[model samples]
Target: ATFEIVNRCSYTVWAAASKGDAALDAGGRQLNSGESWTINVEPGTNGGKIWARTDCYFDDSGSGICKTGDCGGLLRCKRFGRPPTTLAEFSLNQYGKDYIDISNIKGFNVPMDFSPTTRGCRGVRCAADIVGQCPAKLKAPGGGCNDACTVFQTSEYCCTTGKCGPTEYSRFFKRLCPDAFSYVLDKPTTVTCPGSSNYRVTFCPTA
Candidate 1:
């Protein structure tokens, strides 16, 4: 298997991976922070699988986890299989190999109701503003907020006497940002965010 590691974080990341969750530190060997690697996986006799991950932590200390509303970013991928020839082909997984590509994958960034406040608020967690006009129910108390809250300042113009301020500046940016901020494919990091960060995910071939 092969793929590209795309950095979608504000900073860089270190990536790594392992076959069977060996020592947890296995992910540290291959993947690098704010970076990606083009990995080749050959199924072993055990019929297990090859898994990959990338980040900036040695022992899950919560240093560089990518979360929603949090500037700290994480790893994401666009995977391709069955031998890649060009970068673009590898990136978008143009071939669409009939293997287990994006489906049945595992990781902390799994698309779920991942609440930042509920899940340690570290790494790549999801959060949204609560004070302004939030579409969802505010989980935190006192209208403070438990999820990641974006802060901004707005001012009204002389002509707009009744205008309170910039209605929703924070929400504006959030909306503009793309969904699945980070991504990784089958390979590793080639292009990264500004700081050359990296994220990792694992691959397991079944025969």
Candidate 2:
């Protein structure tokens, strides 16, 4: 399967993606405004995620942190990015469909869109200015909105225990970006696309 990463933001962004232990595409390469990169994924790749890092300042040695979406300060991001990032999560060829969604359960740093290039597949996105309107307590120092789990760190907010549902905090995110996952129990966020279809991930999408 192939996926295209497109940057529509006004500033540069470092795009990253990972499937299990494997990194795809440029593996944390910089994507200037209006630039795009296409990545090829292994067939039947599952549990893959794509996200962008903002306000980064990495040296040639690739040692630095990003203001948002920093993945253990590694440019190649061997694992998932830190919280407060908009994520495009996917599981390809799952029961003959490409299961995908944009997740804000970790909170949102940037606006994003995920669309399939093939027919018979519906698109999903979370293109809202979440950071600008982030709650004061949930706001990150640099940018983005911190998840209720990150902010409260309690079982009720984190949903680490028994069945948990959305709270006022989760609803805050859901109200803005209904298409994205706002909490761990957000079952309706996922969408399925036709298998083998190419997907596109766009940052700062306009409409």
Candidate 3:
């Protein structure tokens, strides 16, 4: 899978990525506004993902905490990252297929557009002001819209057994980004594309 991570936000993003536990693109990079970087993921890379960090101030050694999506306090991430983050997830070359989606399960700090750029495949994006429209119950201080699971932690919200249904909070996210994966057991938000498809993930992208 080829991924081009681009930033369209007015500020900055420390972009991060991973293939399973293995880091990609030196674990992450600072993508200033309008900046873009590309990376190639090998086949069979499952649970792979790209995301961003906000309100970060890393020193030259890459040791600093972020207001959202900080991973191990490093410029290069070695893990998935903390919640209150947006995600562009991938499963490449699985049974000769590719699966892609934007996930609000962690939360939403930035608008996102995740799409396959090749093979005429469809794309998904959440350009809504989720942080601005966040419900009181799912609000995170300082930044980001929090997920119900992160707030309540009950099986009803967390889907701890993978059998729960959507609640009002999840619906909040779904209505805004109908194509995104909003909860543990969600709708058909996953889009399958050609195995040879490459992807583009844009932050703060317009329709």
Each prediction's whole-model lDDT (CA):
0.25, 0.87, 0.87
**For candidate 1, lDDT tens digit of each residue in 32-138?**
33444544433221111222332223334433432221112222221211110001111212233111222111112211111111211122222222224333432
lDDT of 2 at 172: 92
Tally clashes: model 1.
53
State how far residue 133 of model 2 sits from its true place (Å).
1.1
In model 2, the clashing pairs are none
Q: List the residue pairs that clash in candidate 3.
A: none
Better of 1 and 2 by lDDT: 2
Which stretch of 10 consecutive residues in model 3 shows the poorest summed lDDT? Answer: 18-27
| Residue 145 shift from truth in candidate 2, angstroms | 0.5
Which stretches of model 1 miss by more than 4 angstroms? 21-26, 29-34, 44-98, 103-207
lDDT of 1 at 39: 43
State TM-scores per candidate.
0.26, 0.95, 0.96
